[PDB]
Design a binder for these strands. Sequence first.
DNA 1: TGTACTCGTGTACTGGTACA
DNA 2: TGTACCAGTACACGAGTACA
Lengths: 105, 105
Amino acid sequence: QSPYSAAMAEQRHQEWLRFVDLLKNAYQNDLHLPLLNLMLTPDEREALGTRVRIVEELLRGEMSQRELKNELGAGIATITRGSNSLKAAPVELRQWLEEVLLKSD
Amino acid sequence: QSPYSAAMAEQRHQEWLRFVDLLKNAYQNDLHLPLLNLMLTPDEREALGTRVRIVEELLRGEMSQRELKNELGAGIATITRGSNSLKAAPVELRQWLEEVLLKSD
DNA sequence: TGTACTCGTGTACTGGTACA
DNA sequence: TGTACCAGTACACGAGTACA
Ligand SMILES: N[C@@H](Cc1c[nH]c2ccccc12)C(=O)O
Ligand SMILES: N[C@@H](Cc1c[nH]c2ccccc12)C(=O)O
């Protein structure tokens, strides 16, 4: 059993909250897409316009191969793979994610 | 019926904005990490750490130089891509980065 | 027969060398 | 001079296959 610097949410590999404070401080206005450029490949317009499009239906249909995740977008894998959402675990904090969507509780 | 996209239309690409306003709100704590991974790019948790960290230090003066780009974590193709990064932004969006470094604020 | 999951490839990442 | 291509890593984006 090794010791741990307090509990809180960030620990072991935090190095991210210092990232959000500046990443969103720009989000307030149109300064959310100026970060998807200074990094060259951040042209994730498809990795964002198509990936968000996967939960968009995963939280409603979640049937995979039936709407248009890839026939004209991109998700077939990024929409059916969502079944593995455990990777970024939604339920852990989906509680707030649903708060801004449904969180019917 | 129609998405009405003739003039302006909603907040322009609501797909990215809906993911920005929801981010900042949860970006305050760890409610954004579930989304940054289960709805953005999760293995990118390292990519963002290294994609901005290069621009972060780029404005400072390091993380790129036949040895900083590497010691940084993967800035070589990145540090160099950082130049191409201007591609997703004609020095305008990069201007927000300066807003928190030299532009003014 | 249908559908789900897993897999493929290109390249995110990571970093080295050569060229511009 | 540093990076862009290129090499490596392992994954992402994207594809296909297998089972039910
Ligand atoms: N996540 C960034 C990673 C990146 C690629 N090349 C870069 C150059 C500089 C900074 C970041 C990057 C992106 O989407 O591209
Ligand atoms: N970058 C995320 C995007 C993604 C791929 N497949 C998904 C399935 C569901 C939700 C998101 C995704 C990932 O690699 O996982």
